Each structure stands twice: as structure tokens, then as C-alpha cells.
């Protein structure tokens, strides 16, 4: 149908689970659309010239194109158009902060009619492609006789690796942890981003023909000149890990832990591995009073994962 339905419909995100139920488990809080409601919520976009929904998306997806190809069925072509310009569309639709990038700028948001649910439709039309085997690895047609190395298994590393392998080269990743995926697997908690789609995409990458080198530190187990001599080119994507600190009267007491180790132990326990810092250690918050310092989404994830594990009282201090 003619998709100009922002006049006689109203924005409504998919169904959310109540607050009395979210506090217990560690699963996600939203749910995938129903076909009858996604087909309607994708009909609201105005197909506007000069689409501000694209100008403010750092990857610059052709949002109106698959937003149109969704409202008329034809979900295969929509998935194709969406995947043609973004490697991790489901992770993006799950974690990308939309109130400042895409759902915060399109023409019907400036007019206070509510904004199109772009990220949820992205998730919908990209997850329904798994459920029918439409996603296939990008194997290189003609094997090229060169080798490229990358340092890091995060989003940038994985995207560059997939692109290089699609070109025809041969790639070798180098990650420090045991499970690849960067802080997408250890930093971001389980309620924001489920740990199944990450490993699904990593397994697809492995099927494409990449080579994984887990448990391999670039500082200890190797050196930059060595890897430089090995391949034709190396891509440094190691990220950032040196955390800040605070010096004040009492900054040397006990039970003053950093956020990253707490989140890492929480994710590990959510996977298993029965790390000892969770059993007998200050990385559990069963019946204690937790206080976090600093702001941003890091403090948000910390305070939420603290209130998950009991934590009779939790507070946050922003300046």
C-alpha cells in the first residue's frame, strides 16, 4: 500500500516485559515484532526526499529503501538491501543508541508525530533471514596469494576481516581473550545484547574462511616487527583498555573494584566457568549496598547488572 501512514497511525514499539519480571532473569527486555505489526509500523515512513534518517546514520544505510520493501512483503530483497551496506545489522539494531543517531532526526520526529521505529524493523528484517536460511557466507571467488593480519577481534576487526576475506585475501586475527568478539562478548551485558547472535555471526565469519588465533597476546606472545614481516599488511584495532582512576582520602580501601572486571565476571558467570571471584569475592552484590561512580552507558550497564543480583540498594553518582 501507499506508505504515508504517519497520519492515521501512532508509534508503538514492540511489547516490553513488565518491571516486576525484568529484575529476576538476565534475558532481554524487548521482543521481536509480529509480522502484522511490523508491516504496519514500517508503513509510517514518509519516503521523504533529503532523508535525515540517512544523514545521521554513521554507516549511512538506505533506510527508506528497505523500509519500503518491507511494507509490501518482499522481505528477501529488503534483507539484501540492508545487508549490502552493514555487516552486523542485528547487533546494530539491538544496541545502537537511536535517540541520537537515526530515530532522533527523521522528518516526522521534528514534527512531533513520533519517529519511525527504524532499529526494531532492522532487527526484524535481519533476524527473519536466519529463520529461513537466506544468510550465506561470503567466500572469495578466486583465491588470492596474499596474507593480511589484524590485531583485535572487536567490531572493527571483524568487519575489516570479513571485507578482506570477501576481497580474496587470506586473513589471521589475533585476540587476547579466549572467546572472540571484543567487548561485545565481555563488556556489553546479557540483557542488552544476547550472546547467541554474536557467536552466530562469528561462526559465519569462521565458515567464510578466516583463521582464528585465540589466547594470543601481541605484547607477550609476539612483536609488531614479527607480524609485520609475516604478512603483507597488519591492521591495529586493539581498542582501549587503560581505565582512569581517582585519588582521594580513602582511595586505598577494600572492595573498590573497576567496572570492566565486574562486567567481565558477570558475563562469565552468565556463561559459566564458575570463576572464583564470584563465589568468595567482592564481585557479587547479593545483599549489599552498591554505589557506582561516573556516568554514561558503562555506569548504566553496571547499575543494571548490580540491581539484577539482589543488591537491596543501588545508587549512581553523576557530576
Amino acid at each position: 500500500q501507499r506508505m504515508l501512514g504517519f497520519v492515521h497511525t501512532a508509534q508503538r514499539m514492540p511489547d516490553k516485559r513488565p518491571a516486576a519480571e525484568r529484575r529476576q532473569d538476565f534475558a532481554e527486555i524487548y521482543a521481536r515484532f509480529s509480522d502484522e505489526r511490523a508491516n504496519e509500523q514500517a508503513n509510517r515512513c514518509s519516503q521523504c526526499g533529503v532523508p535525515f534518517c540517512q544523514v545521521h546514520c554513521p554507516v549511512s544505510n538506505n533506510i527508506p529503501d528497505w523500509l519500503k520493501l518491507t511494507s509490501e512483503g518482499r522481505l528477501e530483497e529488503a534483507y539484501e538491501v540492508s545487508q549490502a551496506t552493514n555487516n552486523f545489522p542485528e547487533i546494530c539494531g539491538r544496541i545502537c543508541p537511536q535517540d541520537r543517531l537515526c530515530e532522533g532526526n527523521c522528518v516526522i520526529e521534528q514534527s512531533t508525530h513520533g519517529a519511525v521505529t527504524i532499529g526494531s524493523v532492522e532487527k526484524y528484517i535481519n533476524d527473519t533471514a536466519w529463520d529461513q536460511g537466506w544468510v550465506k557466507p561470503r567466500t572469495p571467488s578466486r583465491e588470492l596469494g596474499l596474507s593480511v593480519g589484524v590485531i583485535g577481534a572487536g567490531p572493527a576487526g571483524l568487519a575489516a576481516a570479513e571485507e578482506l576475506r570477501a576481497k580474496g585475501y587470506e586473513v589471521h586475527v589475533y585476540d587476547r581473550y579466549d572467546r572472540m568478539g571484543g567487548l561485545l562478548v565481555y563488556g556489553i551485558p546479557g540483557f542488552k545484547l544476547e550472546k547467541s547472535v554474536v557467536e552466530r555471526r562469528v561462526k559465519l565469519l569462521a565458515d567464510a574462511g578466516v583463521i582464528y588465533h585465540p589466547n594470543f597476546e601481541v605484547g607477550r606472545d609476539a612483536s609488531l616487527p614479527e607480524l609485520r614481516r609475516k604478512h603483507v599488511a597488519v591492521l591495529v584495532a586493539t581498542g582501549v583498555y587503560k581505565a582512569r582512576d581517582i585519588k582521594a582520602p580513602g582511595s586505598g580501601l577494600g572492595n573498590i573494584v573497576a567496572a570492566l572486571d565486574y562486567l567481565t565476571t558477570s558475563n562469565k558467570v552468565s556463561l559459566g566457568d564458575t570463576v572464583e571471584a564470584y563465589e568468595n569475592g567482592s564481585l557479587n552484590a547479593a545483599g549489599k549496598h552498591v554505589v557506582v561512580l561516573g556516568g554514561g552507558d558503562t555506569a548504566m550497564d553496571c547499575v543494571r547488572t548490580a540491581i539484577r543480583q539482589g543488591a537491596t540498594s543501588v545508587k549512581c553518582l553523576y557530576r
Binding site: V7, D65, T112
Partner: protein, 1472 residues
Amino acid sequence: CGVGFIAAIDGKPRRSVVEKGIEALKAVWHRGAVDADGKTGDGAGIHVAVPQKFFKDHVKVIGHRAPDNKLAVGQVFLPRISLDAQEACRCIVETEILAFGYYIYGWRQVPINVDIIGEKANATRPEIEQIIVGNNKGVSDEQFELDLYIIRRRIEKAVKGEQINDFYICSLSARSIIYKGMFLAEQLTTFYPDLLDERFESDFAIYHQRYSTNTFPTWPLAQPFRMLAHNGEINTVKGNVNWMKAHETRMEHPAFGTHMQDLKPVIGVGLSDSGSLDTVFEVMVRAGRTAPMVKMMLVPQALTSSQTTPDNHKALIQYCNSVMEPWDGPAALAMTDGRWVVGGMDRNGLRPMRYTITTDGLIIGGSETGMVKIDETQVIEKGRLGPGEMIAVDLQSGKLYRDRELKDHLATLKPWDKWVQNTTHLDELVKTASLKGEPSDMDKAELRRRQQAFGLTMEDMELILHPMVEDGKEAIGSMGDDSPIAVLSDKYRGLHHFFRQNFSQVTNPPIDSLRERRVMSLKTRLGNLGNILDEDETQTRLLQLESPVLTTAEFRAMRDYMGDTAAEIDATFPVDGGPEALRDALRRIRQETEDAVRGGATHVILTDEAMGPARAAIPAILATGAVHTHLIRSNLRTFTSLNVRTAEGLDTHYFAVLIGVGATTVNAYLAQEAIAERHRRGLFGSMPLEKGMANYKKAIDDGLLKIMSKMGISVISSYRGGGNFEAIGLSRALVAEHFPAMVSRISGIGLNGIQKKVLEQHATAYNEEVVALPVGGFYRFRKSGDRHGWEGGVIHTLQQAVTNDSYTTFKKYSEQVNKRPPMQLRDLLELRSTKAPVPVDEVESITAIRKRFITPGMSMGALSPEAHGTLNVAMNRIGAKSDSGEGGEDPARFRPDKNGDNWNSAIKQVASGRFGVTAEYLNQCRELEIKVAQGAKPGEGGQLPGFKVTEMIARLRHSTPGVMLISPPPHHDIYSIEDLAQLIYDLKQINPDAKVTVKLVSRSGIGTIAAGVAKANADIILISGNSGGTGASPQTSIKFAGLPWEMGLSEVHQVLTLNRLRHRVRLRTDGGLKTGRDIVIAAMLGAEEFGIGTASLIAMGCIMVRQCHSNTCPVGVCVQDDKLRQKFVGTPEKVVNLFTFLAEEVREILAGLGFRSLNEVIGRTDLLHQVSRGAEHLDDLDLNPRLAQVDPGENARYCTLQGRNEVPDTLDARIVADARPLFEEGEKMQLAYNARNTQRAIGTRLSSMVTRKFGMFGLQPGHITIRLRGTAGQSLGAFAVQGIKLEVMGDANDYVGKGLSGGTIVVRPTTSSPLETNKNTIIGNTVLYGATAGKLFAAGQAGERFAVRNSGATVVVEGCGSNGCEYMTGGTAVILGRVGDNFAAGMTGGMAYVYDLDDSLPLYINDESVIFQRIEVGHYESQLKHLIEEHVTETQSRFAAEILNDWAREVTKFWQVVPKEMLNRLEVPVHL
């Protein structure tokens, strides 16, 4: 302006004919162009018979002996400056006449009086002489005329051989002579005193006066010509000259003989359209035919598919249409063979022609019905001339043939029925073509790889192709074009982007393709050309198609029919050929074509199906142009045809240019493949493939008709191979070599650039794996596609700067705008002065600059009431002007509000639809405006969707709520430049204070038109650009029509400065103005005022959604819904801040250059330099044609006069002197005067006085009444109000009751006339054009397009003509007689009653939007009864009285015509 003829029916010479011809010429001085000099004219001519007695007496006086047989005289214009070229010309003439054997009597110097010619028409005056030749061989008279014709042709060729200038032969015959020159119309018998003699007596006379568009007269250009006289203009002259060049190579006739070789270039160089048509007319007449047959062949009638004409005439017109291409255009013709005297009209009937028969055996025809004075007690019949009609007088027999009698007498010479049946059609062959042999559609991969090689994107199939297959009509866009021009882009823009379409300004009206569709044909003929100077059966044996476009099955059937007579030509060039592979391929194909045509082939198929990974495809346009031009220049085009199979055609613009370049038929197979591949996926729904193909072909046909209608060409045969386009961005050499006749003012890329683009795109398509087409941004912005003028960051920065009121943010915006790569022509220019900078605080104040900007018109139909009110409030606050646009305005805002806001608009528009134009709407302004063409869509009417017309707009426009309103492309009032002058006179009479503005659109040749309208007393010219926004218009008209304003403005300025006319008008421009740099550049080019438009809408909240037509604009700018109009966020302070910043930027720039005023910079072109983009683009654009600086002289470079250009005073002045007690006390009056046809706008100034004093409805009906006796002029009582009653005894000329607003007009024949009231035409053309209230009772037959755009008037007439009640919107109209074809076309409001006797209305009516029935309700019989009773009371007719007497039996003869949209809205239903 005007043409006319007088003829004695019995065919006997008498002095009265010449006397009346001179008297008629003495009284056309009001339609011509006045001058401050008083002696300067622009042409006049008379054409009479040879007075044998005069010249025989002269010969006797010399000393010879007067011969017995008729004597011959020739009039020649010899050079005057040099006394030696005269002797050379005399030597040539004498040695050529004596070469045949005739006897020369001598030369005679025509006595003249030079003291009455102006200063410029006298500096180029030739020496006028006459030569007397006698027939001593005793040969017959027809052979004498043939010999004289051949002698004249050979003399012209000889004198053109030695390159002698200023030589002309006005006439050379023994039957007729021509006296013409460049003097005033009334000063003819003073410059040529010979006509005052008593011996000049003839039996026929023709006269003509013209209205020139420039001020450099040339004597050999005045009319009449030899055997013709034309009033109007011919549309297809560049298309007819080519086909004449093609026909010349085979025509021959045994009458001429060897001398036929001296008649090969039949159309000379340096003539006008009416000279070319005349030359071909004469060469066709001299070969055996007669004037009626040649008129029928050259300017045919409308071959309507109706049963209202006998099939004898149908066979006749079929033969005439099959033998020769028509010559279109508005035309009133008054021609004369040696024997016949014929007066005729064109196919549409745009010019007027009225005739009169007297009892003295005299017929007088002309453009007005009061030129000669005739007592009413001596006329026999008054009449008119419909479209395509003609009236003839046979002098050798002394008979008068009217239209149908002449047709019947002409259809008895040859058995056309047995000749026409030799043709064969195509649909029969497609049916007998068995449904076998359907090939396999190409694979998806092959289809994508072929589509990528031409740059087709996925939006080209989801936006502009899906509507075609789905509904059968082209798409609709909603905003102006902001894309870079074709040559300045970096993506692959096809070659069909470099050609802009053409249209017709005031000099020529367009044609309505939605209503007047019955006179437009798309026929095609294969195997048609031949000898046009014989009569046989082989001329009507050919293949006939009903459309130039073909599908694949039809093309295969046509190929099977052609068989082994066709020749297939490859059109591919090797990708690895080299740097000059395209040139070699062009030479190869243009040689193979000539080699195959000489070998007996009669069909050339230009197929490019061989495109592969190693062969690129030549662009079809360039290939077909080269081939057609080579076939034309080698005398072979008349043998074969030219069929093209292109793989790039997707829209209606590609077929347009392919057919305009010269191709015969065009088959697009890739579009059909894409359609089939999209259908097999199940996207269209449930319609079959045949339905999709039918809808696609229908859409293509309608698009071709719409494109061809923007110019006035109504037949495809005379449009093909004429090159009715304009090339922008192409080299002069390439265009002049490969394309027949086009202009390329600035140069462009040669063949190397085209080869580079083609090869790069082909490599991208065939060297990489394609998985899907690019999304592409050409109509909507995308990150991958091209660049646009309005992008996100630009808009947001501008809006923030205007809201927060910070000059620094606006400077940031202007920097962001001026830092992108070049996209328009003004980006390659650079400002560079040589003075020293001045402090910023010395330039003009900001107010004095803001009072130079305006906002263009934006109709209330497109915008919301809030946005219109906001703009009007903002502009009236700072002192500048605003505009209301079409669609009228609300009267309640005619006063300042309580807070001090002025919601009015200082500039009212006069659109084509006359949507709200009343008598009070015109007296509430400071400047009027005549919108001829819009920036976005030129040569077309503005549209308004149905749901956009709410109740408020319905009451505001006097229309039906909820129905689509499309203005007519023409004005029905401006059919030539004299019509524009008349309309300007009317508009300056109704408002004694406003200035009249004319709005044009830039193109090639606009300079002459601007110089013409400057002589019509207009004082403001507006040059819109090609990038102007709009509310609703098709995409093909947005993207491929118009030209950048930099060309039009720079041409108009130069042309006006050249004719010493720039110092009288002010120039104004708009379209694509965003920053102050553009304003300064436009001021340097010549403009003085500036229009902003779209930027204003962006300051109020518009974010370029481009959904204006769909009525769902989010911010609520262009919406009529309520819940969306609640989202308006506009504010006048925003517009004020925008204008303030724009003025401060101009102040900054002027201070930086070194001047202190915008006056010091207007016209100073030398401050502009051209810089090239670099040494990697290699575009040869030379902007010097627009940088040319003509030196003004002693006048300034801008307008240096105050007030409007005044006009001469009409009769109304005297009336205002007499009806003083009406304006001082308010008492009834009663006046009587005498009317004459040289008195225009009778009773309009009085209407202005009454409207200003009492209002439109302040006086009772009939408060002041005027009685006129005689022939009223033009625009009788235009814009009259209630309380005024004009009563005419006699007849009115034209435009009677235009813009009536409650008044009353009564027209009746005189008491002493022996004329049936219901059998003689009493009023003229375009009656009640756009009236809103009042009455009008005529006692005769109306003219043409009777009651067009009527809205509230009630009119009763005893007849009508063609296209009556066209697009009527409200009111009642009774017609007591027959009607013409296409009755009630596009009617959407009101009701009509027709008194029909012969039961023929179902044959004439256009049963598309109306239904016709019998009267069944007494409530509707009482209306008719009262109307006819009031008619009888007012006009005292006798026919209507007879009808009223026998009411019971005549009430069963009336047909009631009711629109379809008012069937469920009437209070009393029309049914039982």
C-alpha cells in the same frame, strides 16, 4: 495588425473595390503599435489587379502603340546607395526578359512622397521602379503567366549569383500588382499617390498590416506576398523546410521543362515563415492545381472520426493528408489564384475572420466587422469562419462558394474512394501474425548487466516505470529541480539529458491536450514520399501505423511484412578500438547506410542488439542523427524509412528526442523485458501482461502528445525531423554537423568526452560482478547518488540561523553553500574589480536594499492559509512587495487587522484559468501580473489534486468541492502579441494606478519576444529560471524543460539595450537564489529586482519532504487538512531575519568590491570573469556569449522614469465627464453615444469608479444605462459591475463581456435590418471569458469557444460555434440553435439547455464528463421559461417569441446537459 479582402461576386472591375480597400486600411490604427515619433510604422501592403488602361495610356504617351492583348508590369526594389549596382541589376533584368523573346516597353519611376517616413525606415529605403513587358508572341495568358514566373525565378537566381544586396521583385505578372512598404497604415495613399487616380479599378483587393517584434524594418519583408497574405505564425517551419529539401529531389512536371532545373532550391534564404509557405504555395499552384486544392493540401482540416461529414469529404481529406505534411500554427489566410479568391482558417481556428455579403454583389472579409461603413438596410448575410473552414469566390464564372458547397464541388474531380483503398493497416497484420515464435526472455543476470551499461537505477523502475504499467499515466513530482546540469556532473548522465524541450511564449499559444484532443493525430506512414506534382494511385499505397512506438510482437510482424527489402545496420563500436573509435564507427555506419540505400533497400533498421563484453553501444540519438542528416544531404531520405531499436528508452522523453531527431518508428525492447521480469515475480498483482503492455503504450502515447503540445504542433508528421529542442553542453561543431537545426549558445564536450563516459560506464558494467542495481539518487537525495542544492546540513544551519537570529550562523550557512564544487553556471564566474575597498558603513542602508526583494506567487491552493498569511504579513512589514499567485485571495483580509498587520498582497496575478479575478480583486493592488509560463513547468497549466480542494477553496475559486482543477495551457485571450497588447490595455483601464508585469521563462529567442512586449506598454519583465519550485507537476516537465536564467536574462538585457528600449522597463529574475553572491551576480547581469521563493518556505519549516501533492506535509506548510495545519510553526520574524541577513551580505560584498550602491553595478558586465574547473575535466564551455557588453549610449543602464506607461484615452473619459450626478449624489442616469470599432474597452473605467465608490454590489440592477449604436470594438464592457447596463444596437467584435462581475450587456440587431436573428453572427470570439456574475442577452449566433471558464454568468444566445462552454464551472446557459463539435468539453459545473431540432446533439457533444437528457421536472422548466421570457423582454427577438408561443410542443425539443459531478449535489434531483 490585420488582414482582409474585398471581392465583387459577379467578377467585374469597379473603382469601389479599391476605394473600400483603402478605406478599410485607414481604420486599423488601434491594433498597431504606436510610437513617440508618429511617422515610424512597421509595414503595410495592398494587392490589386492591373489597370490595363493606365499603363496603355502611359505607353501611348511615350510614343509606342498600345497592344491589344493584356500588358504586363513588374515592380522592383533596386539598391539606392550605389549608382552602379542599379545598372548591374537593370542589365540582368533586361538580358533575362529578352532571352525568352518578349518585348520591353520601358521603365517608369514610381512617384512617391518621402516626407512621411520615419528616420529608421528611411535610411534603408530602396529605389522603387516599374518595368513594362508586352506579349508580342501572341501566346496564351496562362503560358504568359508561367513564362513570367520562370523569368522571375531565374532573375532572382542570377542576381543572387553575383552577391548583390537590396534587390527584390514585389510582383511580375499581367493580372495583379502589389503596393507595399514600411509606412503607416493610414499613410498608404499618401506615399503612393497613384492609387488616388480614377483609372485604378479592379474586381478584387487584399490588404495587410503587421505588428513587428523588433525595430529594424526591412522593406522586402512586408506583406502581402505573391499570391498569399498571412496573419499569425507557423509553428513547424524548421520541420517543413527539411521535408521540402527531401521532396525537391524527385518533383518534376511537364509544364516547366528543362527550366525545372532552375527551380530546385524552392525555399530561398533570408525569408520569414509566411514567405516560405507562400513560395511553396505558388510553386504548387503554377503546376496545375487551383487555390482551394492547394489550401486543402497544405493546411488541411481535422480528420475527425465522426459521422457528421459525408465519407466523400473523408476520402478527400485522407488523400490530402497522405500526400503532404501540414503547416501548423495560428493562421488566417486570404489568398488569390489568378482566378479564385479564397479566405481560409487553420485546424484550430485561433485567429478571427468575419465576412459580410451586400446586395451590390460584394463580399468583404477581414479581422473586424466594422472596418468599412455599410448601411444596415443593404446586407444579405453576416457570418464567420470556423476551424478549417474556407470561403471562395470564382471570378471567371462569378459565383460564391461557401464551405460545404465548395467541398462538394471540389470532391467531384477525381475518384478518391478508389484511390484511398490501396493502404494497408498493421493491427490486421498483428492479428494474422500467428501467436507462435515468441522468443525467450533474457536471464536476470543478462538483464542486469545490460541495464548497468546504461546507468539505470532501482528507482528508475520503482518510481517512474511502475505507475506507467499500473495506471497508465506518468508520475507526479512536487518540487523544483536542484540537480547539477548535465555537463557539470560526474556520474553517467545519458545523452538525452543534454537536450531541453521547447515551448511557445506570448507569440504562440500552446494546445490543450486533455480537452482539445480530437485535432491531434499520431499516425505514421511507411513508403509515403513521392512526386508531389502528379495525380495517380501509387501515391496512396503504403503501410499505415496508428502510433510511432511499437512493441516487440508488432515490430516482428512489421519486419516479417517488410521481408528482404530492409537492411540491418550495426550500431556498436569496439571497446579496444582506440581514442577515435566512436568517430570511425559513425563514419562506418553513415557510409554503410548510403551503400545500402542505393542498392534498392527501402527500409533501414538501426539495431544495436550486438552489445557484448567487447563492443560498446553507440548512443542511439547520435547515431540516428548522423544517419538521418547524411540521408538528407545525399538526396536519399525520400526513398527509405528509419526504424530504431534502442536499449535505453524508459521514459517519454527519450522517444520524444528520437522522433524529433528524425527516426520514423522507435521500438524499446529492454523496457518490455524489465516489465515482463517484474510481472513474473508477481508485483503488479493480477493484471495480465497484455494489460501491462497496453497501459505502457498508452502512457507513452499520452506523454508524446503532452510533449508535442507544449509548442503548438498538433500532428506528429510535421514534428519529426525538425529538431524542436535545445542543446546545452554540446560542442558547436558537433551540433552543427550531426544535428539538423539546433542552437548551442555555449559549447560543450566533443566526441572524446562522450567516448570516455560511455567506455567508463561499459567497463563498470561488464568488468565487475553486479549483484543488484545501484539505489541511485536523481529525484530523491541519497548518499550514493549525485549532489543536490538543498542538503541536510544546509537546511538545518539555515533554520537555526533564522530562528536564533545570529548573523554568524548565516555566514556559516552561506560559506557551506559557496564551498561545494560547481553545480550551476554562475559557479564558474568570479567577481574581480579594480578599485579600492570602501568602509562597510558607507554603502546603502539595509532598508533601501530590502525594498528590492519580493516573494514570488504561491497559490492558496498549494499552500495553507496560515503560510500564505504569514508570508503576506512578513513582507508588508518591511516595506517590500509580496504576491498572491493564482487562485484568488480572501476578501476579508482586504483591511489591516486590529494589531497593525496587513494580510493583503501588493501584487495580484492574472493566471490562465482566471480563478478568482473579479472587479474588486483588481482594485486592491499596486501591481498586476500576467503569468504566461512557470519556472518548473513551462507551456502547461498548474494542477491541483482533488482532495486538496476543500469547501473554503471551492468558495474562493467558485468551483465544485472535491474535483481536480487543471488550468488550460493557453490563455484563450493571448493568441498573438496584439492580443497581449489588448489585454494590457484592459488591465491598465480597470486599474488606473497599477503596473503590468509579464512573466516569462528563459529559453533561446526570448530576446525578440521581450523586445516585443516592451512595445506593448509593459514596464516590468520577469525572467524565471529552470530550477523553480512548484506544488504539483510531472517529472519529465520538471527535469527536462527550461533553461538557466543566466542565459535568458543576459539575452533580454542585450536585446533591450540594442533597440533603445532598456530605459523603459525594469527587469526581475528568480529561481535558485540562496546567498548574496548570486544576488550580486544577477544584478551585474542586468536584473534590478529579485524573487526568493523556496528559501522563504525553508525559513518557515519546510524540510524538502517533496510530498506537497499528496496533501500530507508533516510540518504543515502545503496542506489543507486540519490536524496537519495544527502543526504550523511559522513566524513572520523568521522571514524578516532572513531578508535582513540577505541584505547585509550584499552590503558586505558591495563594500568589498568598492562601490556604494546597487545602481553603480547594474549592467557592469566587465566585473565578471570566467575561470575553468581545471585541467582534468576539459569542458570547452565558453560563457562569453553571456558576458558580451553592448554599449548603451546616452541613456542609462536601467529604468529612469517614474509612473506607469500611459495609454491613449478611450470613450470612457467622456462618460466620466457626463455622469457626475451619479458620483456626487447617487442618482439614476441614462446616456446615449455612437460606437465605432476603433474604441476598445467601452465601459471599463466607469466600472473602476463604481467599484471604488459603491462596491461591486452597492447599486441596484440598471442604475446607469448606456446606449450605443454601431459596431462596438474589442473588449466590450470588460470587468463591468452590477448597476451598469450597456445596450448595443449592431454587433460587437471580440471578447464581449470578458470578466463580467454583475453587470448587464444586451446585443441586438438594428430595427431597420432585413436579417433573420438566428442565422447571422452577432458577437465574436471568447465570450464571457471567466465571468463570475451577471447577464448577457444576444440576439444572434456567438463565435468560437463560447463561454469558456464561465463561473456565475447567465447567458442566452441563438447559436454557437466550436468548443462552446469549454470548462464551464458555474451558471446557466441557453442556446437556441445548433452547436459545434466538442461541445461542453471539460465541463464540471453548471447546467445547459440546447434547443435542438434535427436531433444531432449526440453527434456533436463530448460525452466524457456530462450527461444529456430530456427535461422532466417542472422546477427546471420554470427556469427555462423565465430565462427565455427575460430574453424576449430585453432583446425583443422574434425567434424566441415564436418558441415561447408554441411552448407545449417545443418543450419536447430541448436537451438538458448536466455535469457528472453535480448529480448527487443538487437540491432538486434531475431524475424522477
